[PDB]
Design a protein around this ligand. Structure first.
Ligand code: HEM
Ligand code: HEM
Ligand SMILES: CCCCNc1ccc2c3c(cccc13)C(=O)N(CCCC)C2=O
Ligand SMILES: CCCCNc1ccc2c3c(cccc13)C(=O)N(CCCC)C2=O
Lengths: 464, 464
């Protein structure tokens, strides 16, 4: 039960001693983030641990992190940890490996250009207005509002319309078969029973693939596959969404995106942007209600750029420095990816350190973001860290809320524009105050997702 | 049960239609060799079939075969089919993959040079004499002789002494712990129940690895590991064998052969040279007893080069053209590897044919060796095919008894020198005649090893 549990003693690398079979998973009782803080404080710059039989080497050195995420990305550190039975979703860009990934990123990167993005702002902006009208009636009511649900619906509306050209008010159509399915595409909690068991029993993943058992519920994938097949066959008789952009890239080097590859990207885009965007949007409105100074300052900035509740535009969005500072400071405190990982594909020596084939090199983003050594008052919400007076003292490989290098988040600038468009229209119309249900201070789940312990609820007063 | 069973219909490639789950394995009731002849005759140049869910594309075109075994060996077609739970034997050169294999072949090729080989002939030659004295007493007795056993013991003696510097008369020491274990390293019958089940249930191989269950009986591997560890620790206090040559290459580019890598090569060498050498030596003496003309002609050639029962030498061995013709013609009829295989590592187009990632490209050596289109009277034993008058009409990619290109048999010229040294000393002293037990004509097993149906027995008369 300890065939590989000797690797870090032999390489001289420190860390918590592993138990036969389990590795260090019982140390996850407090969640990925507490585990990474404790190891960092205890073992220092570099340390190892075992997810079952799987050795994970954590690195915290900015120069080492860059070699991994940027320098030897293609040569050595190309892929993330395989994580369970995955079926045809093996070809979604976030899961594909080595040369297939590079072909998919080349094929899909033209779809996330700033040019295409500002062509999508009129679509996103429309559901900002839907978000507002939904919020006002739950404000005129005066009853506390669950951000998870108002911003979930917003994020869904922006995916349904920019991904597929489907226009739904999901908040007022929770039974549209398109909403019911897509709502099921939540992010994975790698500390829940199924994934914990998979971690101790990875030899069982090939058995689940053969039974077409899949972490993506084949009930929802099947729906979307046949949905996309329908949109693909319609339209062609008679738009600026992701699906169309992928239909078009099938008409030119690299082999055009096959029909099933295409569907796989549509799905992963949903999975990668849905519960993420809503989690950040909720964390941000949590900090704005517990720091009224900042909320007022931001409402003041928005009103100056968009006088008279003027509708936001791509260009007026990139203008708002304080809004950028607020978004960023929220992502420092709550980097919802928690860790970046890369599989070491071959024996290497980066920065004087020998990394053997097979190890999972992991960057504890949550921990580096709250390290005393780089950040004053590291638990405080303090947007002035990202003022231009201060943002140059910030290491791009310490602050990695979207990752770094060729395999960073391909939807970053889309996700930032989307969240800010939401915030502008929400703050033009409303102020957000705490309640008695409001967990102050916010507690994070001990699970495997960086999310509040209990969901966040707030007062929403109308400014008019 | 037919997720991949549609590949050859879609690519336009012909072949026998597969059954859910099984693929075409039930067609193996007649053995690998009959299956390959029937498909060749029926589907022609190229055809596909499924070993369980595993698609195998057979190719018979000499130009296509060369692209696979020679041209795109490193780029595309580097590795053989994985075949079962294999433990630490994952690093033996015949099993290792991609860049690890290339490092091992670079490290071990200097050990199979002609220079080192003629330095080993005095060792091999010694057990030729042991073979003779063993044969004479079973000849003076007059009782039929089982070649499997006389040549098994010969091959063992040559491995024990050239591999490890261990000198045993295995025929007269069947209880030496070193003989008992090494005798257990027989070749795999991929049509026996365990490997058939593995072929239908490959998703179970990771479960067997985790239980340290291994196709190499960990009872024998453990013995040799600790044996080599002993020879390694002895000697060093106080030789021209393979082990020493590997000890020496650990003292220089590529990282020297680690202690466990070294042991893995020692073992695989045994597995690759033991039952192979004895099978060919037995097939050859079968043809010499059923073609007395050829046996006399060869005895005549040997006596001319080595007058007065003179002991053979490296240089007098490469002299004997008829002996070379006999060995080669026997290997045509009985290429004991039966097939060469390479895994297609990425989508390629060789010779106008699209090969997708994952397919096992297989070369039916047995079948090409008995193809009417290249060979007159293809079932006849006719050594004059390899006379210099005729051997230029022979395609090196049709006749592939040791494979071809960078991944051919690294012990070829050793195995040829070894078999010929055996034949010379045996034919200087004895003539071999059939018996009534002698299966005429020889029938091949319907199993997965190319071997006689019933073992071969012969009269052995002394020439003096
Ligand atoms: C606030 C919202 C989001 C955050 C914080 C976020 C964060 C991240 C992080 C940390 C990574 C890992 C990159 C690495 O390993 O270095 C990632 C990858 C990725 N993200 Fe985002 N993401 C967000 C929203 C989105 C959206 C809206 C999309 C697309 C519509 C998206 C698509 C992807 C994809 C496809 C990957 C995998 C990229 C690849 O492997 O090539 N994400 N994300
Ligand atoms: C008559 C005796 C033998 C025959 C007919 C034979 C035949 C073969 C064949 C057909 C291959 C496959 C090559 C390919 O895939 O193209 C092979 C590989 C190999 N043989 Fe032999 N072999 C014999 C004896 C030996 C001996 C004596 C040794 C070493 C002592 C040996 C070591 C190997 C090894 C290590 C491989 C794998 C090479 C690699 O993957 O790099 N064989 N053999
Ligand atoms: C063989 C599969 C075992 C399944 N098990 C895990 C799968 C994936 C991950 C994983 C992680 C920890 C423990 C188990 C697994 C992990 O940190 N990450 C990085 C993202 C941070 C939240 C993973 O992608
Ligand atoms: C996933 C493992 C399934 C096990 N099963 C087989 C393993 C290996 C081979 C194999 C073959 C046929 C059918 C099953 C397997 C085969 O032809 N060769 C080439 C050598 C010719 C005798 C193999 O190395």
């Amino acid at each position: 039960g300890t065939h590989s549990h000797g690797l870090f003693k032999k390489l001289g690398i420190p860390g918590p001693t592993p138990l036969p079979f389990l590795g260090n998973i019982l140390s996850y009782h407090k969640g990925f983030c507490m585990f990474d803080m404790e190891c960092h404080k205890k073992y220092g710059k570099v340390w190892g641990f075992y997810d079952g039989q799987q050795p994970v080497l954590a690195i915290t050195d900015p120069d080492m992190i860059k070699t991994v995420l940027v320098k030897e990305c293609y040569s050595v550190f190309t892929n993330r940890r395989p994580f369970g039975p995955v079926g045809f979703m093996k070809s979604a860009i976030s899961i594909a490996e080595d040369e297939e990934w590079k072909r998919l990123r080349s094929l899909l990167s033209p779809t996330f250009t700033s040019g295409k993005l500002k062509e999508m702002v009129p679509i996103i902006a429309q559901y900002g207005d839907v978000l507002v009208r939904n919020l006002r009636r739950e404000a005129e009511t005066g009853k506390p509002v669950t951000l998870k649900d108002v911003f979930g619906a917003y994020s869904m509306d922006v995916i349904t319309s920019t991904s597929f050209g489907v226009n739904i008010d999901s908040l007022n159509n929770p039974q549209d078969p398109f909403v019911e399915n897509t709502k099921k595409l939540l992010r994975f909690d790698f500390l829940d029973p199924f994934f914990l068991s998979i971690t101790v029993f990875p030899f069982l993943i090939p058995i689940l693939e053969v039974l077409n058992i899949c972490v993506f519920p084949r009930e929802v994938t099947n729906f979307l596959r046949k949905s996309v097949k329908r949109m693909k066959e319609s339209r062609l008789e008679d738009r600026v969404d992701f699906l169309q952009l992928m239909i078009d890239s099938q008409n030119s080097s690299h082999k055009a995106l096959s029909d099933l590859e295409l569907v796989a990207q549509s799905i992963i885009f949903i999975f990668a942007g849905y519960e993420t965007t809503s989690s950040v949007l909720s964390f941000i409105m949590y900090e704005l209600a517990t720091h009224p100074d900042v909320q007022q300052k931001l409402q003041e900035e928005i009103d100056a750029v968009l006088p008279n509740k003027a509708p936001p535009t791509y260009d007026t969005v990139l203008q708002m420095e304080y809004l950028d500072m607020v978004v960023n400071e929220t992502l420092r405190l709550f980097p919802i990816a928690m860790r970046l990982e890369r599989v070491c594909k071959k024996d290497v020596e980066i920065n004087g350190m020998f990394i053997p084939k097979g190890v999972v090199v992991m960057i504890p983003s949550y921990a580096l973001h709250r390290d005393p050594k780089y950040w004053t008052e590291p638990e405080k919400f303090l947007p002035e860290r990202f003022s231009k007076k201060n943002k140059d003292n910030i290491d791009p490989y310490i602050y990695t809320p979207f990752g770094s290098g060729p395999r960073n988040c391909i939807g970053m600038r889309f996700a930032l524009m989307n969240m800010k468009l939401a915030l502008i229209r929400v703050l033009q119309n409303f102020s957000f105050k705490p309640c008695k249900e409001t967990q102050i201070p916010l507690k994070l789940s001990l699970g495997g997702l960086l999310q509040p312990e209990k969901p966040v609820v707030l007062k929403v007063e109308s400014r008019d």
